[PDB]
Design a protein around this ligand. Sequence first.
Ligand SMILES: Cc1cc2nc3c(=O)[nH]c(=O)nc-3n(C[C@H](O)[C@H](O)[C@H](O)COP(=O)(O)OP(=O)(O)OC[C@H]3O[C@@H](n4cnc5c(N)ncnc54)[C@H](O)[C@@H]3O)c2cc1C
Ligand SMILES: Cc1cc2nc3c(=O)[nH]c(=O)nc-3n(C[C@H](O)[C@H](O)[C@H](O)COP(=O)(O)OP(=O)(O)OC[C@H]3O[C@@H](n4cnc5c(N)ncnc54)[C@H](O)[C@@H]3O)c2cc1C
Lengths: 482, 477
Amino acid sequence: EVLFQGPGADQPIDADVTVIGSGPGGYVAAIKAAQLGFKTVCIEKNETLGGTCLNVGCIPSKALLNNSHYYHMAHGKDFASRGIEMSEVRLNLDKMMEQKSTAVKALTGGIAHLFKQNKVVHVNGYGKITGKNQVTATKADGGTQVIDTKNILIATGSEVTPFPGITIDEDTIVSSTGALSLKKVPEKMVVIGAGVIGVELGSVWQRLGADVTAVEFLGHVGGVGIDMEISKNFQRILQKQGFKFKLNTKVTGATKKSDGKIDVSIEAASGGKAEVITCDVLLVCIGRRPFTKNLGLEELGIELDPRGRIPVNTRFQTKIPNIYAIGDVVAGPMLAHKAEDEGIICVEGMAGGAVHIDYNCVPSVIYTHPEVAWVGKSEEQLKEEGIEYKVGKFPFAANSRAKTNADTDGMVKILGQKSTDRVLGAHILGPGAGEMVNEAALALEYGASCEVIARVCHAHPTLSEAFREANLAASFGKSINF
Amino acid sequence: VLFADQPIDADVTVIGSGPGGYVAAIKAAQLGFKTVCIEKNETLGGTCLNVGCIPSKALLNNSHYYHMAHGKDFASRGIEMSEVRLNLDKMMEQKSTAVKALTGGIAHLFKQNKVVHVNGYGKITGKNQVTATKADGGTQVIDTKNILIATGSEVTPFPGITIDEDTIVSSTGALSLKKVPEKMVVIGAGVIGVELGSVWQRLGADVTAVEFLGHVGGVGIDMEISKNFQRILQKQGFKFKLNTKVTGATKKSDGKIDVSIEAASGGKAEVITCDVLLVCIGRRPFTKNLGLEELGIELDPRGRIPVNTRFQTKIPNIYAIGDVVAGPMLAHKAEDEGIICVEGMAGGAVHIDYNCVPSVIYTHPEVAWVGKSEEQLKEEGIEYKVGKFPFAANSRAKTNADTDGMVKILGQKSTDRVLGAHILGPGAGEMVNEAALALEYGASCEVIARVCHAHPTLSEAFREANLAASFGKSINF
Ligand SMILES: Cc1cc2nc3c(=O)[nH]c(=O)nc-3n(C[C@H](O)[C@H](O)[C@H](O)COP(=O)(O)OP(=O)(O)OC[C@H]3O[C@@H](n4cnc5c(N)ncnc54)[C@H](O)[C@@H]3O)c2cc1C
Ligand SMILES: Cc1cc2nc3c(=O)[nH]c(=O)nc-3n(C[C@H](O)[C@H](O)[C@H](O)COP(=O)(O)OP(=O)(O)OC[C@H]3O[C@@H](n4cnc5c(N)ncnc54)[C@H](O)[C@@H]3O)c2cc1C
């Protein structure tokens, strides 16, 4: 294949666009560039395409959350309450892990097919930018291949942020990558960090039978930008499921022991209150950071911001104007759909089009049960900016679909601009949050008012009616069903 | 309370407490109208709560979980169960708990909103008066400025077949069968029939639906969608006889039923025996004993009450909404008509576009749609483009291993305006509400594809089908 240039393929090539990395940013940018008429190359170092999201991220984590949630429903009260009677429910963890790998495998292979269908040249190698118009790929056999290119698109992604003095071995001290592949349910697990990723993987193992505590330096669960009331109610729900939390707590260190266990040393974040908690697996997920190793940036003189990111303009140009960057290597929320959207518009701009994105319209989702999802501003952001607003809330306990399914934790909260009725934020805690937020993203895109939303005919019975009614309550002062 | 009868004085008197009427009464009260709601049955909530959307969704949900457990699905995810039993009584009890909770909820919302509840059979006895007659013959007279008729629908009978709710059931009896029938025949493969048929098939019944028309899913379903849907349900074990009329059914001495059918064009007579015959050929508007003939309000040839765009009958202080009037017979349509009818009584604008009203079928896979089908755009001569995106290329669906179906988007050639959206597959019911928002906005396919959808979501299929209709290709397929 002209379309696959792996070890032993080392002839010089030319391209209009050369994308470095095949994660959500890069693979979508490559496909789009080819569809716009650009002769396109995508360079990837790993054995599969799809990056962090496909291989060790969104995909395998959602598979395990979907399966562990079914396990919990089968194993607990839920199924027996519906007349579905089982003698024994057993965990087969090999088999659940196989369902996960099958999905990854299919989706990673899908990308390769898409690249082929759209004539994207896939170079398997490590790409280094060796001049303003050139990338050199080094291959697994030591070989090298030069790409002569008009434009370069950096989409090199992120890595796990290491924790100083705790060495991640992916055995009993694991990152998200090793958490996704434990070979047995651990009796006790400590999670360092109660961000989205930690909460999700913690919840997975907790449902499968682990005792789980998450330790977090900050005062709230679910990461940056989550509305505080949502976070607090979410926390409370997770705690009743048996997830434990130590917030405002730092981890001062950890030690592997002769019994095989791990003593985690912790104290209050302000100072004081030393304790040790002991666990079988220690999951370290304090963060992710941009990945730009060996890319050639220093030599080209592209300087990083202090967090490791590549500074870009509104068209995603670095300070060298034919060298662009997107996704988790640049500023903004480190999310797959944000990387894909940046990819698309970057490459559209290279072809002549307009380039604007507002990160406020980027939703977030936590795929626990209940789910959490939001888009636009939190109440904390509105107070900080001096914006005057009204609140509408509608609990899932008063929604008919949620009541019929007997799945009624949570609420929708809508934040509207006090004078104009403009929808400023939507926050959803409960069943179907992750799908429902997309209706809210559509509305924010057009600048909808809470009234416009409330006037749209939503299907009955649907979880979406909670969204409709929280808008009606923001707009009119009261909903119909609560 | 209870110490020569006294009339109630009201601004608005609502006859019926289903989705249309209960909602209209709450809203009226919230707008400051002194409001009364009359209901003849023992509980509030009408067809939807008591014998309709609610109990049917409860059984669909629970039977689906039963099919996942009893089948291979849970095994495949490493959830290993030694034996899986149905306890039908307990599944029915979960259904009844949901119904009871929600019907009591409405009584509570009428108290919270100061809606006066009258329990009786309501007859309009004057341009400004309704009389309710209780089950014991006691009368309550309400003298009222406006009257809102929200008297709903009933089961359409099949001529020559008598439903007795025992072996020959309507939807109501189908929802309370005491035991899984060995064999069931369903007359009608519309939304209600497909749903209740699927429930009982998952529970172990051999189910066949017989339908006069050539497609499943009822009126206005897109044909491509409908064919694909029927294929999937056939692979689940649900059998269909399309282009087939039922000529009659005989209640046999041994307790079974003999159903006679043949081709809808003519010919091919055969008889199929079953244990339960579900008759679901339709629903019709219910106006019995309401006093219309005496006020001079004539019905249309289908039995509906003709109203203006503000929901006024020919007597302008008497209104009608929901399943008793024209347009799709759906709960959310009745609810919207009730809210806007009462806003219009306070002097505001009244707008509902029926083309924007979604439909959902709560089978697994779900089906849902809003706006126009390909068939409708062809009849109207509209030039359009098509985008399709299969759930098999959707990340979330693939991750869940639940990958039947597709999103299909119909776009206008000249302007890129979205004209219809059609969803077969996981999450279709909730997904159609983003689609309804788009159809209401007259949004363009280009703009919907540009909106930042969360990854991985089933909604990305919707986003990419829009992309495909607008630019001509999607990213992931
Ligand atoms: C456990 C977990 C769960 C998550 N869940 C979600 C979620 O549910 N939703 C969501 O939106 N986000 C989620 N994320 C975040 C999401 O994975 C990232 O935001 C996303 O993958 C970033 O895409 P990208 O294209 O910028 O980078 P990456 O996916 O990190 O892809 C970078 C690619 O570049 C390659 N590469 C780097 N340097 C070079 C080089 N010099 N030459 C060649 N190749 C190179 C890497 O091998 C990699 O394949 C999750 C992440 C984790 C870890
Ligand atoms: C099995 C089944 C499943 C369904 N699934 C769905 C679905 O999933 N989604 C959907 O949108 N729709 C669904 N429907 C349709 C929905 O039930 C109706 O469209 C909706 O209930 C109509 O609401 P309404 O307020 O017009 O009438 P109705 O709900 O039928 O309420 C009419 C009420 O008026 C009362 N009444 C009538 N005359 C008088 C009188 N003269 N005095 C006092 N009271 C009176 C009745 O007793 C009843 O309570 C379903 C229906 C059925 C049968």
